[PDB]
């Protein structure tokens, strides 16, 4: 509530429950190879 | 020397833990080698 940012980019999609925990940068391995990769220096929130 | 890492060979680190986590082992090895170089340079300064 007390930080400022240049811009906020929101990305939305749908996956199964088994893949929800895979959005973590380390856990991205299976998803990242073909579908969706989150940067190692990611700064933000993941909401599902 | 190992400096508490899964291996002491640099390339083995790059082919056994994947970029998301091998950075930690790389960092540990980096700190160990840098400390050793520090000790060598300080000994050299005193001897000089």
Curated annotation (Swiss-Prot), chain A:
Assembly behavior: Binds to host ACE2. RBD also interacts with the N-linked glycan on 'Asn-90' of ACE2. Cleavage of S generates a polybasic C-terminal sequence on S1 that binds to host Neuropilin-1 (NRP1) and Neuropilin-2 (NRP2) receptors. Interacts with host integrin alpha-5/beta-1 (ITGA5:ITGB1) and with ACE2 in complex with integrin alpha-5/beta-1 (ITGA5:ITGB1). May interact via cytoplasmic c-terminus with M protein. May interact (via N-terminus) with host bilirubin and biliverdin, thereby preventing antibody binding to the SARS-CoV-2 spike NTD via an allosteric mechanism.
Boundaries of the shown chain within the full protein: 388 to 435 of 1273
Function (record text): Attaches the virion to the cell membrane by interacting with host receptor, initiating the infection. The major receptor is host ACE2. When S2/S2' has been cleaved, binding to the receptor triggers direct fusion at the cell membrane. When S2/S2' has not been cleaved, binding to the receptor results in internalization of the virus by endocytosis using host TFRC and GRM2 and leading to fusion of the virion membrane with the host endosomal membrane. Alternatively, may use NRP1/NRP2 and integrin as entry receptors.
Protein name: Spike protein S1
Region described as Integrin-binding motif: 16-18
Organism: Severe acute respiratory syndrome coronavirus 2 (2019-nCoV)
Superkingdom assignment: Viruses
